[PDB]
Amino acid sequence: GSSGSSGLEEFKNSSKLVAAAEKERLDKHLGIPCNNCKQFPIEGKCYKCTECIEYHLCQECFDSYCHLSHTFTFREKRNQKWRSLEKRADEVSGPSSG
Ligand SMILES: [Zn+2]
Ligand SMILES: [Zn+2]
Numbered sequence: 001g002s003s004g005s006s007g008l009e010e011f012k013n014s015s016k017l018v019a020a021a022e023k024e025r026l027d028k029h030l031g032i033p034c035n036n037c038k039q040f041p042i043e044g045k046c047y048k049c050t051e052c053i054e055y056h057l058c059q060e061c062f063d064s065y066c067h068l069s070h071t072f073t074f075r076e077k078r079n080q081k082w083r084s085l086e087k088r089a090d091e092v093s094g095p096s097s098g
Contacts, residue, residue: 002081031075034058036066046075047085065091 019026025041032048033040035055044059051070062068068089073082 004081005078007079028078032056034061036061047072065089 027041029043029046030041031046032042034042034057036057037060039058039060042058045062047057047059047062049055049057049067049070049072055067057067057072062072062074065088068085072085074085075082
């Protein structure tokens with residue numbers, strides 16, 4: 001399973017505001033750094049390979065669908081659980097030969 005912190009209360013909810021880019025834990029969304037670019041914190045979503053060991057990617061690197069080859073899973077904002085990504089695989093041409 002997974003760790004589900006209790007709550008039953010919605011307060012101090014964030015708001016649409018411009019935030020600066022600084023190298024320091026600003027939000028509780030540190031989770032795990034990227035294994036490719038090594039972006040930390042990972043402002044973008046949090047992805048991980050369910051086939052490899054200690055492997056995690058970021059929304060950015062994910063946009064490239066490089067590691068997508070394996071079964072990855074993305075999480076959601078607090079009070080949520082991982083999710084099974086769709087088989088979104090466009091790259092089918094494969095210029096390998098032509
Ligand atoms: Zn990355
Ligand atoms: Zn993998």
